[PDB]
Ligand binder design. Structure first.
Ligand SMILES: Nc1ncnc2c1ncn2[C@@H]1O[C@H](COP(=O)(O)OP(=O)(O)NP(=O)(O)O)[C@@H](O)[C@H]1O
Ligand SMILES: [Mg+2]
Lengths: 489, 407, 244, 81, 82
DNA sequence: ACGCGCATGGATC
DNA sequence: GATCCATGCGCGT
């Protein structure tokens, strides 16, 4: 009676007369498997233009999305077209932006044009405080030595944990439970001052270190360890201390990385005046400029600064939601916010390779891949090859938008994930031109080749007319403008 | 596990004799079983003295840097403090070792190292000390008097270990004094009875429950391998000493225990890295020998590829749901005891709640639909589009940050 | 430099689990009395010697299997030294039954199972002439190594269901049966398939029912889970654990 | 094994010359052979000194540490003893 | 530079890699790594920056697939190997 | 004589 | 190739 129910197990006793399906029946195939309020249409079928293909928008986004295809096939326009329909996806009764929260890791400056009323955060103006780290990345950033550094490791956490307690301006009940992984503000220059002081330790016959500051001599214990954070202290002892002359290279490696201005966005002087509240309003766009679309420009920064930038934000957005559940778990209300993270070209920071320089960024996107479905932090993976992303992350996506793929291994990767009943739709993958794609997963009724709706406001990723630009004059490229920006980059 | 605890004979009402202990790391079974003892980080009081010597060198110590002098004074303090606090026969007293699991005061161990950090000796090069009773030689008979803090060394020249343990002591004060190890190093862990620990784990205390959730979500990663191994050893030797009294008592009074290890590849990895060797050995101990003693595994893992070949082979019943990773399918199909027709493409095409069960407890390898859970592990799947569809709500960032702050 | 080593050993000597190998009775026992114990030549003669290794820890399980297998083999090796000197008609032939032979003899040159590997493989390669033969009974043939499984000549293939197990067996079987790929998983209870030198042709046989069957004392988990929550049993467990 | 025991040469009465060793883990062959000898952990007495060098290493030494200094004194202590 | 002036990339550059098996092969040894990723970056993200590649090679099965997948235009001469 | 500071060196990662 | 630690030797207060 006009309602379509999936399943080919229904038997038709022969002979049954056959007509071509009507228009509304073709609508009914891709529509009634989704409830009326969960339809999120952003594409049409390739075979029939006048039918729309809606997906279960509740199921489209909470389960992770993986968009793959060859270069120039139309991934970035489709990623943008999903988000433009997500922002416009408002309920009736209000004029203003809706509750969409999308974070884009943009590495080619494309989504600025696609979203004009959006907040854009390049590295030079982004401030990510170093004291927001949970100890695990406090170790891998500052420590360049990995194995036999137990005294150097110990003095690193003891300085930070003690300095986090000092800058506490509230009740002493939650002063105590401050730890090395607890995200409280500490001053990095005082921490170097402590370690440089501990490199100049001096002890008496009793083996207890005594110091001397502008108020008087004091014994180094738990309560008086806070007085080594200032430079104007002198050691008063007969013998060299336990760490005397053992932290010289440690301070050298620690200082050379604070003054490293690639890490000026994290270890700069702007991290002193930026608080915990301002950082979360920056990455989610809850600040003065409230926007659904958040874009971070990590376009032409080197890998190492890009690797810390991806690994910090992915965990800190997860650990926002990891602690956004237990407030709701202890209060039982419905006022959560869902966050979707767009990972354009995830091969650059979450590949299949097991190198140690790809380690800290893989786990941050791994942890969103499995446990991120629990805390409203979902991921959208864009990549050129499905077989280059790690299977621990990329197989966790239950929604697939596959563009043209010509690589045999890439074709084989789509193939074995799919069953053999509807596995013949993979044979049209290399014949896919610009625009159309295959959507499969739990969010759609049947996997089908569909034509993605054209972006009326497209990203700035226009294809270069190579021949038409070659028929012109030998143009005089202003080499001074390119070089002096290359050198500043 | 819901139908295990609801399965009773027609003679009573209340709780049955099912005993299930769940190693829950993703925090999923508090809502699944509301009539159970969920043991969190603050709830658990796990004694540090029930560890063997391998976990004690993983809880306090680190990698060796030709620091055998610092390691020896640590072991000689604990293996002596275990003797002093032992209140049994002298015959058992001599067999006490570092790996032996009796009580020792960790704060007294610090004071032994603190005294040994400043020791002084005479020309005869003998560590002479001073106490309230009198002046005494440092020897094995009188080394138990160094556990007190108010001891002053007396000697002409500095001792052998004088000033050689200053960097040893402060690492230790970063451990018992660390607040992320409160369960295994707190003051409650000092005063907890050995009987009180076991009745907490199997829920035999004041509040008795068939199912005990061991919430290890907040347990730190570098310590999680110690605690999984310690509890698994404690449960196994509970079942080992079950059968030792069963031969003498010759009566049918058994306590069968089933342990559920979720994300079991994490505590039992196929990699030979030294991080997860303690928890692998304890799980393998129950996998190989726990069948005789009434302690049974339930390996539940979403990624069965890193489960070790030896431990996963001891399983005799297999409940295979949908597996999307091909590495998981080649792992499962090779160690699967039976097979069904067209099984290579069947594993991705299994539906939601559909399982394939085979083993020696079911004669026909059958494809089954697991009956829907009426008391679910709460469906953690946030409705997304309609929650995006509403107005831009003002998220209360202050209470989110302040809970993040205390962690 | 040797306190952890001195501490590691003392934990093994005073271990009550390793009493059967490191107790005071192992010190006072003699080399002769061990071999009377192993093949039942002591005060009570028996054709079957059952080595209940259920209580043996799995770390030392490969050690004790290797120790016994080596002791049986060179019992048969030095048995031939008398027979070439005295030329006596009598002989002492020994057959060893390795239930779950896949774990004693895996397909790995790992240190943790190397000792029990070479003891079985020495018997499978040399023990034919010394009167020490082995019987392999494993539910997983495909983890038994090829260099020991192929030294067997008589093969009793029962119902085998894992496709990795069928392909390992079919390669090393000395002869084949028509539709062996479908015949092996379709064998009923007690249905076997024997090939080799002892039998004439590979025939599907029916093993005779055991009048006195091998039964294991298995804990009926569901049966005790129906009963009352036991209360007096828990306090008896800890007090013996405390006392021992 | 039951058939290999109960057959005799008919010229005698008593035990035959069969010699069988079973390595059972499931503890099941007592009910098959009631008149046999069982050697569980309580009654079996295996000498540690009958182990060779490789079995003595696995019984005591650890492979994961693999410290060269631990092994050498163990050879000097045992071979001298 | 042109994006600040709201223009497209002015000069396009084509890099012809003749016999790329000598420096960008299928094999994954460390000595071929630093010349591999140099041509991966042109193959992956070089389309929008005006830097494209021309891969000349003696066999399709010795060049790394990741560079070789992004080459949408394929020219094939006589190939005797099946 | 005891102490402190400077070496040379060892082990382990 | 670090770190971390031990051991030895020569010297001043
Ligand atoms: N739905 C569409 N209809 C028509 N043209 C489209 C569509 N989607 C993309 N295109 C065209 O695709 C080109 C840009 O491709 P793009 O969206 O950047 O895909 P891409 O895979 O992200 N490129 P890359 O980053 O190198 O992988 C332009 O020429 C667009 O006109
Ligand atoms: Mg793109």
């Amino acid at each position: 009676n006009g309602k379509f129910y999936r399943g080919g197990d229904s038997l038709a006793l022969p002979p049954k007369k056959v007509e071509p399906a009507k228009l509304d029946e073709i609508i009914s195939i891709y529509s009634d498997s989704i409830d009326i309020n969960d339809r999120f249409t952003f594409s049409s079928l390739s075979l029939n233009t006048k039918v729309s293909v809606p997906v279960n928008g509740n199921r489209f986004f909470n389960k992770h999305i993986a968009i793959v295809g060859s270069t120039g096939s139309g991934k970035s326009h489709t990623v943008a077209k999903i988000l433009q329909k997500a922002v416009d996806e408002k309920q009736e009764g209000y004029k203003g932006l809706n509750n969409s929260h999308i974070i884009i890791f943009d590495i080619h400056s494309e989504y600025e044009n696609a979203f004009p009323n959006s907040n854009v955060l390049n590295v030079d103006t982004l401030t990510l405080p170093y004291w927001l780290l949970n100890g695990d990345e406090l170790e891998e950033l500052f420590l360049d030595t990995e194995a036999n550094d137990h005294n150097q490791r110990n003095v690193f956490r003891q300085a930070i944990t003690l300095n986090k307690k000092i800058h506490f301006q509230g009740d002493p009940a939650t002063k105590e439970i401050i730890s090395f992984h607890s995200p409280y503000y500490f001053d990095i220059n005082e921490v170097i001052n402590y370690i440089n002081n501990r490199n100049n330790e001096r002890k008496n016959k009793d083996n207890e270190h005594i110091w001397s500051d502008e108020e008087g001599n004091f014994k180094f214990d738990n309560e008086n360890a806070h007085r080594l954070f200032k430079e104007n202290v002198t050691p008063d002892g007969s013998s060299a201390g336990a760490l005397n002359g053992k932290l010289l290279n440690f301070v050298d490696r620690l200082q050379s990385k604070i003054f490293d201005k690639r890490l000026d966005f994290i270890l700069g002087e702007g991290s002193k005046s930026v608080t915990f509240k301002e950082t979360l309003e920056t990455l989610i766009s809850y600040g003065k400029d409230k926007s659904n679309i958040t874009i971070l420009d990590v376009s032409g920064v080197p890998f190492e600064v890009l690797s810390i930038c991806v690994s910090l934000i992915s965990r800190l957005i997860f650990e926002f939601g990891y602690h956004s559940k237990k407030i709701k778990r202890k209060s039982n209300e419905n006022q959560d916010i869902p966050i979707l993270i767009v990972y354009e070209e995830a091969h650059k920071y979450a590949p299949k390779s097991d190198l140690s320089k790809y380690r800290t960024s893989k786990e941050a996107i791994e942890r969103i891949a499995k446990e991120g479905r629990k805390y409203g932090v979902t991921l959208l993976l864009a990549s050129q090859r499905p077989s280059e992303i790690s299977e621990t992350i990329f197989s966790q996506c239950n929604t697939f938008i596959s563009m043209r793929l010509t690589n045999p291994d890439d074709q084989n990767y789509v193939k074995r994930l799919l069953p053999d009943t509807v596995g013949d739709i993979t044979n049209l993958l290399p014949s896919l031109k610009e625009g159309e794609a295959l959507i499969m997963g739990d969010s759609i009724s049947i996997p089908s080749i569909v034509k993605i709706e054209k972006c009326t406001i497209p990203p700035s990723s226009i294809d270069i007319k190579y021949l038409d630009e070659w028929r012109k004059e030998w143009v005089d490229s202003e080499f001074d403008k390119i070089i002096e920006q290359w050198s500043k980059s």
